[PDB]
Design a protein around this ligand. Structure first.
Ligand SMILES: *[C@@H]1O[C@H](CO)[C@@H](O)[C@H](O)[C@H]1NC(C)=O
Ligand SMILES: *[C@@H]1O[C@H](CO)[C@@H](O)[C@H](O)[C@H]1NC(C)=O
Length: 400
């Protein structure tokens, strides 16, 4: 679509770049809401397409018509507030509902000029953030992750692509979903929209999950037919790490009986270790709460190697078969070396209630308390605050 003339007022977010030798340096970034959250409408008020579908055929017979008929609305700071997004200093507060309207925001980190996504090169580096998870009950997902979105939102692929990163265009992830727009142009062919994806943090106050999802195609690729499915170009399931799945059920959860208490703030430090040739070989994680380092626990089931980090051997042993077929940890590492976009979001799920994250082997939630209708009876205004985002050398983004 074509942006109107309203003024975009991106919330500011301060973030940090650190090195062992000179500490962490503060800088200015901006947050942009997904293109779809801005509101894409025809002149008469009708929409241009819903998630899961090709864009409205009357409005979008071809790419050029779609660009002219579908209008994206700029978002001023009140529009950002009303979409559940506010910031303050180094803190990003995302709210699931505003005046009982589901806003479920998803946002990306922009460079200081606001014209390009801030491209993070994570292989061989460290990534830390503080988080506040207390208002996320079962069924909620407060996510911090990376996708290999085009840095300019897809503007360079076509003369009809106008939004760019400035208005939040170009989203993709490893599920290869069909969205009405792809790279800022109408998805006339209905391709699924795929790209490598690194889920650093997928969580609620009851359970947390980590999962790299490699794709065999680099950058944003529109799939067709079987390319979009489970035997296609991207690993839908990923190679997961959730302490509850490896039988360490007192590691993370609500209260002082857990190693990491989700009702209070804590720091998440992730280190992407590379070998001598520069390939990614392992993903490590540790936590800081009350000034103590809390190391991840070693696998506590029979089968996988007795370690506390992700590697190819841990993935093969715990059944991540598409991950291994698509290249495993090296493949994810390549995407992460080309550079990826940081995405933050909050959501729930009517279809499965986030079962994979916090039910059965994955956590302590029963089978219905994660239903959107029951979540509000536990927490009327589910939300998450991410803050103090620090990117740098291994050993430099956090400390005790
Ligand atoms: C498709 O666009 C046409 C033209 O504006 C509009 O009349 C119709 O309401 C739209 N259909 C949907 C489902 O939005
Ligand atoms: C889970 O943990 C207990 C020890 O806490 C261990 O004895 C048990 O066998 C483990 N279960 C599996 C299936 O590994």
């Amino acid at each position: 679509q074509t942006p109107d003339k309203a003024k975009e007022q991106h919330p500011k977010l301060e973030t940090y770049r650190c090195t062992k030798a000179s500490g962490c340096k503060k800088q200015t970034n901006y947050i942009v809401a997904d293109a779809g959250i801005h509101g894409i409408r025809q002149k008469n008020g009708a929409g241009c397409g819903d998630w899961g579908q090709k864009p409205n055929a009357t409005a979008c017979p071809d790419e050029a018509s779609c660009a002219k008929n579908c209008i994206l609305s700029g978002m001023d700071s009140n529009a950002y507030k009303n979409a559940g997004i506010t910031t303050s200093g180094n803190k990003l507060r995302l709210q699931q509902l505003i005046n009982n309207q589901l806003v479920s925001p998803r946002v990306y980190l922009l460079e200081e000029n606001k014209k390009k996504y801030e491209m993070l090169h994570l292989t061989g580096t460290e990534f830390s953030f503080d988080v506040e998870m207390e208002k996320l009950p079962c069924g909620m997902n407060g996510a911090l992750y990376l996708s290999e979105m085009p840095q300019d939102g897809g503007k360079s692929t076509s003369r009809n692509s106008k939004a760019g990163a400035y208005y939040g265009a170009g989203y993709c992830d490893a599920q290869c979903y069909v969205t009405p727009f792809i790279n800022g142009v109408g998805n006339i062919k209905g391709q699924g929209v795929c790209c490598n994806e690194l889920d650093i943090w997928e969580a609620n106050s009851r359970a947390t999950h980590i999962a790299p999802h490699p794709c065999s195609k680099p950058g944003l690729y529109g799939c067709t037919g079987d390319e979009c499915g489970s035997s296609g170009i991207c690993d839908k399931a990923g190679c997961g790490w959730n302490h509850n799945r490896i039988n360490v059920t007192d590691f993370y959860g609500r209260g002082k009986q857990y190693k990491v208490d989700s009702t209070r703030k804590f720091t998440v430090t992730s280190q992407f270790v590379a070998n001598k040739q520069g390939d990614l070989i392992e993903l490590h994680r540790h936590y800081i709460q009350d000034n103590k380092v809390i190391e991840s626990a070693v696998v506590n089931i029979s089968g996988p190697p007795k370690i506390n980090f992700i590697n190819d051997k841990y993935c093969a042993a715990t059944g991540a078969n598409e991950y291994m077929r698509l290249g495993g940890t090296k493949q994810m590492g390549d995407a992460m070396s080309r550079g990826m976009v940081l995405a933050m979001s909050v959501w729930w799920s009517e279809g499965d209630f986030m079962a994979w994250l916090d039910q059965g082997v994955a956590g302590p939630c029963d089978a219905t308390e994660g239903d959107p209708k029951n979540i509000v009876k536990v927490q009327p205004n589910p939300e998450v605050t991410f803050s103090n985002i620090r990117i740098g050398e291994i050993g430099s983004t956090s400390s005790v």
